[PDB]
């Protein structure tokens, strides 16, 4: 109940102006009421609303230019009056008359010398999901957003700095990018670059970052405004000769490419949670870049590392299928027909020099897992890191030489095999299946296991209690409750044969209850989940190529953060050899229509 | 053969006018035949048709203004003549000339002072599925429905009460809402409110209910006429300031919200069988209301009650998995290899103070089920109520301490687990799956079990008779017919392994018959039902969000009928603090295009 208090600071506003006949006279443009109310009797000009309202802010608010013209003579200084607090801080009526598309009161307030650099630093202006909008601080940004061109030009004519920033360090161009209207603000980007005229030696205003280092180009890459991004790419390209339908162009590639820890554009496209920024991957300077960076120097390094990983796993399992494992020379099977096991896993028998090869490849696994961890001292990181935890757990478990060492070999074995599926993404037409695993587990099954838990607890708890009476020597599916859940689980997935003896009678309730489980769960809840996975598969299969491209990009970015130079040059042509400067361009050709 | 008699009262009409040359002369506009037939010789004016027809009603019916003008001099009083019976009662020709879009005979009949308050209270006018239309009683309503504007205005000019009601208490506005044409009648709603002029102190005609308490606004909510409903919502809203694209509006929320037993709009939206009224849930004053009523004060109470229910079920099963259960110290197994069971469920052994905890939690279950019933002294009510019947059945079954107590624990156990699925609806992306259960069982399986019954009786009856010859010591699937149905059922759902021995020979017919069952039923009838469920899943998954919203609304309405105040305030802002009266409004904002 947070913004309710906001409304409590709003409706009080709707009370106060309602009970102030000055400001109720500022509601409606009753000039005669302003003359008798204002020019005749003495009235203070300092009547403050719920959060800083003046009657000049009210007539400014409710479209009353004629009332504000009466308010000029009674208030030369409420032109300079901001709003007090907690929603609107530093906002004056200049911002207000700017906002409502015009008033021509901009002529009146700049005629009374309004502060063009007034920062509306209130709560409701700041970037928030609770706020429905984000216009910045300065009214130049406000008129910039609402597409009031001659008003903006009039604001440059009154010396408003285009280079002014907000609390977030954003320039007015950064504010233009954050607007959801895209081509409706692109012409403002065309206009304000003409007002770069006094070229600052720091930047010509197009390379100015925010507090988090976002140049507006890279901001447009982060925000995924493709319409904006293409138009800024019109600036970046430098076309060469055209040959009929052929056209040689030369993209700039400075902020796009990785540089000397520039934290490149592509990195911020991957690391953002914004889904639609990956449409920037569909751009032809982008897609060609990652295409070239994959088809050479990315793909053979990836497949070579994956082959080395294959030799690591085969090197692992081979020294893992051979284990010391004496005969059970120790104690006899004390529970009858229960402890069927005979191996007990030898203590320090490091003899039999076949086991020396086991020792060598075992040390290969230990050292390789140490290499994995030294990579990872700073969704598939967790498989390899926790896998390496399991390798060290079974390693120390062998050095202490304790008993229960089958479980870390088990965990590390299923993780060690399944972790090679990360390498399937560099093998196009097998790439997006890992994403299909991701959505079928985390997107569907994790929000469906909470439903199946009901049923498995139901019939597990049923069949245990029904078979509390029975001899577990016949149909030992449910002799114990924690394994009754297990048998019930396997019956749910249609794995077990289905318990039936035919030699003795069943309990009579079991025939009903097993039919009930047979209907509601075997065909019914199961095939629904199958249909969910089927919708998932077609849904991913629709856009699997772009998703594969995202796999390639994330693979490349992850590769560059873990690989030095001298074998990875930065791609694209170099400058400086052809008079092109330090910028590393790239050329590409395209036949037309 | 009911309305056939209607036609028997219709075709007789087509006989009588055919055999009356007065009224056959009223069929066609033969003025000369009316002059020689009427003005020359003496003829009675009281010739009644099949259900009250006059020749003035016939010339009124078959578009004969010129004949009716001859009928004015011969009949000054058949202007006042109603129709007799059984279809048309109290209908006069004023209603008729109103109905056929004009005649200008409205000028003639009101020139002869026609009764504007004449109630056409016949059978065919009353609201019925057998009737194709519903126009009310008064001809003002009739001209209102057929969109004859100046005719309607002319009827107000002749003092016709707009506040008149039908047999059902419906005002003419209520009749306007019930018409299937929606925007074609909305302008009549615009027009007749201008004729509210003599403002009655009871209501200004817009709040007048019918006999079942339906204000026309709430009628439009019940009937789901969204086009009407939005237009009546135009009246209800009271917008505050606009800020560029921002717009603060303030919906009224009086008849929408629950009040002091007003029986609110949303209740009647849920309780109606009309499917399309739930589109009223899609309205932005509605959807925001139920959204706010859920996101605060609905959802934590729901999840808290569901967690308490989880502790009730876990508290149940825990004292249900532990049962007294002596060894079978009584009688020996008298049938050989049949009565495999050894527990027999102790009588009054309430010792062993672990069983005191069983007694305590057992009393927790008993008292909680009593609480469930005291809730329910006045599709998921039945699960919890009959569940609580099963808890009391096993409770008294333990107090009498009889034998067959495994079955009420079984029923109450599967119902007690499955009943928590009602609580999954307040967990979005898991909500509509319960509806998927509802449609896959009640909408598909219940109309498919009648088909599978054929096959299971077929091959069950087959395999029993084929194995009448065999030793049931081998393949005891079908030693008895009521379990032959059971084995046949499990073979249908592909659960049993499929009986095959390979040590002895099978009967030769069984190889044919089991192949026949294997084709027609294992793959064939099964996968068809799987496809039905697949269409059901996609079909529900298309509109699952609106269906989830319906779950939230029904959850809220069901919650308010079972929960007092002092912890549930009525939502929305209160009036009376800001000069807004007693009506509890709500504000909401929307950025434009």
Curated annotation (Swiss-Prot), chains A, B:
Residues 481-500 dip into the membrane without crossing it. Glycosylated. Phosphorylation at Tyr-134 by SRC leads to an increased calcium influx through the channel. Probably dephosphorylated at this site by PTPN1. Phosphorylation by PRKCA at the calmodulin binding site delays channel inactivation. GO terms for biological process: calcium ion homeostasis; calcium ion import across plasma membrane; calcium ion transmembrane transport; calcium ion transport; parathyroid hormone secretion; regulation of calcium ion-dependent exocytosis; response to calcium ion. The keyword Membrane applies. Glycans are attached at residue 331. Its main location: membrane. Expressed at high levels in the gastrointestinal tract, including esophagus, stomach, duodenum, jejunum, ileum and colon, and in pancreas, placenta, prostate and salivary gland. Expressed at moderate levels in liver, kidney and testis. Expressed in trophoblasts of placenta villus trees (at protein level). Expressed in locally advanced prostate cancer, metastatic and androgen-insensitive prostatic lesions but not detected in healthy prostate tissue and benign prostatic hyperplasia. The chain crosses the membrane at residues 301-321, 359-378, 379-398, 405-424, 445-467, 512-532. Residues 1-300, 425-444 are cytoplasmic. ANK repeats lie at residues 17-47, 51-80, 89-118, 135-164, 168-210, 212-241. Signal peptide: none annotated. The modification Phosphotyrosine is found at residue 134. It is a multi-pass membrane protein. Residues 322-358, 399-404, 468-480, 501-511 are extracellular. It catalyses: Ca(2+)(in) = Ca(2+)(out). GO terms for cellular component: calcium channel complex; plasma membrane. Homotetramer. Probably also forms heterotetramers with TRPV5. Interacts with TRPV5. Interacts with S100A10 and probably with the ANAX2-S100A10 heterotetramer. The interaction with S100A10 is required for the trafficking to the plasma membrane. Interacts with BSPRY. Interacts with TCAF1 and TCAF2 isoform 2. Interacts with calmodulin. Calcium selective cation channel that mediates Ca(2+) uptake in various tissues, including the intestine. Important for normal Ca(2+) ion homeostasis in the body, including bone and skin. The channel is activated by low internal calcium level, probably including intracellular calcium store depletion, and the current exhibits an inward rectification. Inactivation includes both a rapid Ca(2+)-dependent and a slower Ca(2+)-calmodulin-dependent mechanism; the latter may be regulated by phosphorylation. In vitro, is slowly inhibited by Mg(2+) in a voltage-independent manner. This is Transient receptor potential cation channel subfamily V member 6. The chain holds residues 68 to 678 of 765 of the full protein.
């Amino acid at each position: 109940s947070w913004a309710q208090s906001r409304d409590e600071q709003n409706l009080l506003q709707q009370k106060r102006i309602w009970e102030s006949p000055l400001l109720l006279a500022a509601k409606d443009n009753d000039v005669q009421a302003l003359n008798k109310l204002l020019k005749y009797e003495d009235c203070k000009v300092h009547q403050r609303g719920a959060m800083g309202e003046t009657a000049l802010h009210i007539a400014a608010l409710y479209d009353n230019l004629e009332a504000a013209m009466v308010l000029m003579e009674a208030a030369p200084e409420l032109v300079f009056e901001p709003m007090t607090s907690e929603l609107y801080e530093g906002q004056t009526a200049l911002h207000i008359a700017v906002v409502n598309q015009n008033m021509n009161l901009v002529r009146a307030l700049l005629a009374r010398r309004a502060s063009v650099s007034a920062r509306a630093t209130g709560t409701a202006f700041r970037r928030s999901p609770c706020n429905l909008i984000y216009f910045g601080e300065h009214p130049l940004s406000f008129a910039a957003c609402v597409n009031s061109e001659e008003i903006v030009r009039l604001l440059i004519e009154h010396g408003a700095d285009i280079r002014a920033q907000d609390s977030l360090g954003n320039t007015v161009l950064h504010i233009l990018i954050l607007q959801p209207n895209k081509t409706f603000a692109c012409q403002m980007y065309n206009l304000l670059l003409s007002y770069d005229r006094h070229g600052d030696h720091l930047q010509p205003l197009d390379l100015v970052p925010n507090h988090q280092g976002l140049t507006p180009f890279k901001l447009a890459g982060v925000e995924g405004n493709t319409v904006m991004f293409q138009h800024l790419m019109q600036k970046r390209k430098h076309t060469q000769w055209t040959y009929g339908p052929l056209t040689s162009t030369l993209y700039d590639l400075t902020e796009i490419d990785s540089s000397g820890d520039e934290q490149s554009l592509l990195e911020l496209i991957i690391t953002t949670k914004k889904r639609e920024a990956r449409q920037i991957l569909d751009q032809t300077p982008v897609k060609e870049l990652v295409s070239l960076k994959w088809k050479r120097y990315g793909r053979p390094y990836f497949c070579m590392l994956g082959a080395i990983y294959l030799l690591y796993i085969i090197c692992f399992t081979m020294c893992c299928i051979y284990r010391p494992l004496k005969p059970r020379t120790n104690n006899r099977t004390s529970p009858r027909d229960n402890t069927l096991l005979q191996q007990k896993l030898l203590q320090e028998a490091y003899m039999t020099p076949k086991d020396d090869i086991r020792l060598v490849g075992e040390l290969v696994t230990v050292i390789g897992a140490i290499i994995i961890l030294l990579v990872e001292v700073p969704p598939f990181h967790v498989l390899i890191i926790t896998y390496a935890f399991m390798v060290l757990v079974t390693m120390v478990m062998r050095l202490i030489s304790a008993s229960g060492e089958v479980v870390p070999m088990s965990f590390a074995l299923v993780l060690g095999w399944c972790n090679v599926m990360y390498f399937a993404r560099g093998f196009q037409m097998l790439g997006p299946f890992t994403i299909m695993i991701q959505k079928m587990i985390f997107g569907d099954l994790m929000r469906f296991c909470w439903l199946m838990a009901v049923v498995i607890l139901g019939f597990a708890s049923a069949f245990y209690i029904i078979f509390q009476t029975e001899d577990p020597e016949e149909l030992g599916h449910f002799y114990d409750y924690p394994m009754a859940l297990f048998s019930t689980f396997e019956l749910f997935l249609t794995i077990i044969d289905g318990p039936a003896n035919y030699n003795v009678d069943l309990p009579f309730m079991y025939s009903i209850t097993y039919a009930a489980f047979a209907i509601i769960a075997t065909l019914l809840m199961l095939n629904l989940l199958i249909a969910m996975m089927g919708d998932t598969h077609w849904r991913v299969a629709h856009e699997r190529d772009e998703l594969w491209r995202a796999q390639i990009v994330a693979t490349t970015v992850m590769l560059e953060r873990k690989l030095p130079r001298c074998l990875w040059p930065r791609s694209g042509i170099c400058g400086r050899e052809y008079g092109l400067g330090d910028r590393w361009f790239l050329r590409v050709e395209d036949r037309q229509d």
